[PDB]
Write a protein that binds this ligand. Structure first.
Ligand SMILES: CCCCCCCCO[C@@H]1O[C@H](CO)[C@@H](O)[C@H](O)[C@H]1O
Ligand SMILES: CCCCCCCCO[C@@H]1O[C@H](CO)[C@@H](O)[C@H](O)[C@H]1O
Ligand SMILES: CCCCCCCCO[C@@H]1O[C@H](CO)[C@@H](O)[C@H](O)[C@H]1O
Ligand SMILES: CCCCCCCCO[C@@H]1O[C@H](CO)[C@@H](O)[C@H](O)[C@H]1O
Ligand SMILES: CCCCCCCCO[C@@H]1O[C@H](CO)[C@@H](O)[C@H](O)[C@H]1O
Ligand SMILES: CNCCCN1c2ccccc2CCc2ccccc21
Ligand SMILES: CNCCCN1c2ccccc2CCc2ccccc21
Ligand SMILES: CC(C)C[C@H](N)C(=O)O
Ligand code: NA
Ligand code: NA
Length: 510
């Protein structure tokens, strides 16, 4: 099996897996949408009771599977629980990352497209101080790029440039993946993460200098870091907080597990896993939290900034920040740096959610890396047309796979590893080779707290939220549901074929 070459390479690759669009785009919206500081308490608690423990569990499962030549859940779940149903539940470890990649790579391509256009100055000329007259040009810019519906039909019409950029983006992802783990993903991470960190720090500094008659960046930080102990009682904020923790740490996507399957069997995963997790959190709360929110608040005040985030999820990152920057000297270039940052953050994460499918095809169906990467790219490219042309398809996929799916899968993997496989066998597997041991209290958290926490969350989700999504959405949501259910069927068929190949190969081993 391929293995990460260096400890630094491993850490930066895992850090790049985690640090992405979730840190700079998703986090600000979730926080601004849920009261800022009021969102942070449940967030921090979720990180301690869910994020950290699950991270160690996934690293352990991955390393454990990798030692036997398996990097994905269909096989790993079976290793931990030799029951056919383990293989079926394992399919989610291929389905979730594939479905997320199908829309994630497209959003990533928008950042490359914007970066290009901002670099060459093909951007809107706002007018020369009425907020709408300032934001409208940028809103139109985004809307024309992705092709937002102007009429009643739920159809999107992406610009030709956007389509071509998606193609280029897919090519770039392929160029990294086709070189493999050490010479591809690891090598790239050593270049991308330093760049990402530097660009992000620079942007924070520039945003911190923003002052207007409406406020300063400081007012933004105060909004995000001031506790509101009176929301701690709202399930919605908790659901939002936990969902963000999963998404931002790449947990429940089968991605951490696959990356860890390339860690040598003897290697530490305790300190490594904790470091990757802490690195992501710093990038999220310190860097991602200090850019778009402070900027929006400084220029429009808290009440307006919040209204902006609630009106549209991509407003802050793709419309508001660039609009604000355009009001300052060299703003178009700052816009370029912002989208360039988002692109690298996205690229390092998208290669992480495509690798599971690649690992499955290599490990279980024995395809060459070249063929595994190309077929995976073809499936994602083809499937992405649904997200590019059908309005709200992206939201549907992000919900089923990227939101509820990951929480369900996180609970599932914990049960299979800590309950079925054996809590003591699991605890032993996690700590084996650790540079540091996992704090003892966490054994009780993993075995009782985490699963109980998630179980309650999921029940509240299915009872007071999932019905509205099943009853109040446009009929076209069924087009997406149908297609992704088909993808699950297809992946299950591939796992069935891997079974038969194994049987064929065994009866050849006799
Ligand atoms: C291989 C699967 C192909 C599915 C049909 C894809 C059709 C894409 O079609 C292309 O879309 C672009 C963006 O909207 C347009 O700018 C191009 O003019 C148009 O030809
Ligand atoms: C990264 C380089 C992307 C180049 C494609 C840019 C597409 C932007 O725009 C397109 O350009 C075409 C040729 O210039 C024209 O024929 C199309 O009508 C026009 O919409
Ligand atoms: C579920 C995904 C379906 C993808 C089918 C896409 C078919 C593309 O259709 C094409 O789109 C272009 C740009 O929007 C138009 O200019 C062309 O006239 C139209 O035929
Ligand atoms: C979910 C997939 C949505 C795809 C949107 C496709 C819009 C394509 O465009 C439509 O194609 C039709 C047949 O080719 C033509 O009859 C229509 O006049 C044309 O507007
Ligand atoms: C809810 C999860 C909280 C995790 C915080 C853990 C802080 C670590 O706590 C420390 O762990 C060591 C090893 O078990 C003990 O020897 C120390 O006495 C204890 O203070
Ligand atoms: C229009 N709905 C967007 C849903 C996808 N999305 C989310 C989800 C919640 C809050 C904000 C955002 C915007 C940023 C983002 C980035 C990467 C993947 C999904 C998303
Ligand atoms: C100067 N060498 C770094 C550039 C090459 N690099 C990048 C960086 C950004 C976008 C694409 C690529 C191409 C593929 C690749 C693969 C492995 C390491 C670096 C890179
Ligand atoms: C799906 C994951 C790879 C997403 C990544 N953790 C992010 O925060 O953008
Ligand atoms: Na993240
Ligand atoms: Na990333």
């Amino acid at each position: 099996r391929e293995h990460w070459a260096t400890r630094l390479g491993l850490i930066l690759a895992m850090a790049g897996n985690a640090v992405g669009l979730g840190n700079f785009l998703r986090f600000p919206v979730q926080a601004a949408e849920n009261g800022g500081g009021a969102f942070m308490i449940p967030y921090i608690i979720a990180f301690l009771l869910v994020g950290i423990p699950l991270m160690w569990i996934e690293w352990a499962m991955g390393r454990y599977g990798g030692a036997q030549g398996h990097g994905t859940t269909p096989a790993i779940f079976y290793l931990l629980w030799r029951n056919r149903f383990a293989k079926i539940l394992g399919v989610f470890g291929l389905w979730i990352p594939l479905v997320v990649a199908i829309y994630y790579v497209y959003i990533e391509s928008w950042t490359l497209g914007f970066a290009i256009k901002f670099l060459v100055g093909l951007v809107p000329e706002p007018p020369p101080t009425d907020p709408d007259s300032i934001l409208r040009p940028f809103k139109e810019f985004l809307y024309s790029y992705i092709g937002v519906p102007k009429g009643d039909e739920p159809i999107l019409k992406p610009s030709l440039f956007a389509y071509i950029v998606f193609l280029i983006t897919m090519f770039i992802n392929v160029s990294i993946l086709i070189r493999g783990i050490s010479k591809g993903i690891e090598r790239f991470a050593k270049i991308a993460m330093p760049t990402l960190f530097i660009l992000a720090v620079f942007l924070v500094i520039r945003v911190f200098l923003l002052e207007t008659p409406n406020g300063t960046a400081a007012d933004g930080l105060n909004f995000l870091w001031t506790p509101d102990f009176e929301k701690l009682k709202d399930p919605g904020v908790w659901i939002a907080a936990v969902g963000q923790i999963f998404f931002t740490l790449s947990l429940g996507f089968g991605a951490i597990i696959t990356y860890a399957s390339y860690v040598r069997k003897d290697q530490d995963i305790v300190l490594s896993g904790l470091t990757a997790a802490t690195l992501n959190e710093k990038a999220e709360v310190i860097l991602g939290g200090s850019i778009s929110i402070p900027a929006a608040v400084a220029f429009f005040g808290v009440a307006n900034a919040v209204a902006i985030a609630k009106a549209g999820a991509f407003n802050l990152g793709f419309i508001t920040l660039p609009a604000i920057f355009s009001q300052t000297a060299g703003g178009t270039f700052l816009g370029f740096l912002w989208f360039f940052l988002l692109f690298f953050a996205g690229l390092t994460s998208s290669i992480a959610i495509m690798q599971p499918m690649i690992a499955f095809l290599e490990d279980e169906l024995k395809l060459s890396r070249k063929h595994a990467v190309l077929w995976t790219a073809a499936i994602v490219f083809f499937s992405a047309h649904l997200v590019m042309f059908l309005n709200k398809s992206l939201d549907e996929m992000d919900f089923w796979a990227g939101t509820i799916g990951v929480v369900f899968f996180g609970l599932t993997e914990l049960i299979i590893f800590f309950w079925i496989f054996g809590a003591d066998k699991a605890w032993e597997e996690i700590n084996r080779g650790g540079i540091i041991k996992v704090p003892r209290i966490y054994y009780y958290v993993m075995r009782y707290i985490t699963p109980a926490f998630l179980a309650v969350l999921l029940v509240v989700w299915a009872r007071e939220y999932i019905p509205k999504i099943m009853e109040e959405t446009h009929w076209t949501v069924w087009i997406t549901r149908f297609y992704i259910i088909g993808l699950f069927l297809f992946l299950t068929f591939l796992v069935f074929l891997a079974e038969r190949r194994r049987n064929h190969e065994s009866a050849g081993t006799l």
